[PDB]
Structures are given as C-alpha cells and as structure tokens.
Amino acid sequence: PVKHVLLASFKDGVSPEKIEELIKGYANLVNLIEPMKAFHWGKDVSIENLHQGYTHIFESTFESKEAVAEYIAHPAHVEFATIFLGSLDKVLVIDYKPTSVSL
Amino acid sequence: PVKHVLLASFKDGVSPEKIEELIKGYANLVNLIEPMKAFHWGKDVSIENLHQGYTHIFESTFESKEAVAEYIAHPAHVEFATIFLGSLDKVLVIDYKPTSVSL
Ligand SMILES: [Mg+2]
Ligand SMILES: [Mg+2]
C-alpha cells in the first residue's frame, strides 16, 4: 500500500481547537476520496531533539502509486489543501511502499 | 505502539550497496534490542516535490514510550548509530502513537 506521509508544524496563532478541526478535516478525505483508504496521525513526542521543528505526522494509506496519483488530482483534496496548508509554516511529504527485510 | 520514524538522506559517495547493508544493519536492531519489535522502511517515491531532500523513511514499532526510551539507552543502538549517522547528511526523527479519529 502506498503510504503517504506528511510532516509539519502549524503557523503561529493556530489554536489547539483549530488543529483539532483541521485534523478531522484532513481525515475526512478518506470519506470524500475513494482512493484514500485509511488515515492516522499523531503529535510528536520524541526525545532526541532531532524533529527539525516539525510537530505532527499524518499517515494516509493508499493501495497503489496511481491511487496517491488520483488523490492529488481530486478536487476535494485541491480545495481542502488550501485550508490546511494556509495553516502551516512548513510541510514535508514522503510517499513510500513499506519495504521489509524478509524472504 | 510508539512508532519511531527516521527520515534522511545518505551522504555523497554512499553506494547503493552500502545503503543496502546499512538498512539491513538497522533492521537488525530488532534482533539485538528487545524493546524494538518491528522495522519497515522505504525509499521516497513522492510526486509533489515536497520531500525536502530526504530520500528514505525508516519506521520502527515499539509498544510504549518507555520502550523507545530504553532502545535509545541500548549500547548496541549507540554503537550502530555511529555507523549509520556517519553516512547521513541529515536526519529527521519523529516519535508518535498512531492516533485515530474514532469512537
Ligand atoms: Mg476512501
Ligand atoms: Mg526486539
């Protein structure tokens, strides 16, 4: 499954309540967008001080590379991204297929 | 489960074969370190050009925050980290508990 990951920090002024609604708004793309299967997230609680300032991590689970492809090409995603991104000071995205060391 | 994530790029000169052995060396910390349960990884295949230069993503799965705690305090991890980190131009770490939007 193509795992779609976004790491970011919320701009100055963004309230805890806005972030709550923003995250619920992002997770709602599972419902609005067929190719996006599951959505998980979390705040960072590391201890190594190597987080580069990023505070959250969002993980979405697609079935194929083409799925992430369409998702980006979805009008609901294009609309919502404006709302969310406007709340960020920085965004880091990664797309990978969980590879394992096995036989 | 405390998900431990590392994102990074391999310094100039690092060969594809070194990265292969380096990744196998990292995954081997599951065996050497009791608290570290599973390990998955992947190269980045995003399309948004928002990867900030990072090329890989490593995911480790611990059961609790204290588990990641001990892992960092493990001599085998301290030793191996020197080998791996010496191969990186930059490292970004995040520790989170996959939170879901549900009842
Ligand atoms: Mg869906
Ligand atoms: Mg273990």
Swiss-Prot record, chains A, B:
This protein's GO CC annotations: cytosol; plasma membrane
Cysteines joined through disulfide linkages: none
Induction: By salicylic acid (SA) and jasmonic acid (JA).
InterPro entries given in the database record: Dabb, Dimeric_a/b-barrel, HS1/DABB1-like
GO biological process, any: defense response to fungus
Cofactor(s) needed for function: Mg(2+)
Residues that bind Mg(2+): 30, 33-34, 36
Function in brief: Heat stable protein involved in defense against fungal pathogens. Possesses antifungal activity against diverse pathogenic fungi. Possesses antimicrobial activity. Possesses ribonuclease activity.
Name of the protein this chain belongs to: Stress-response A/B barrel domain-containing protein HS1
Annotated organism of origin: Arabidopsis thaliana (Mouse-ear cress)
Gene that specifies this protein: HS1
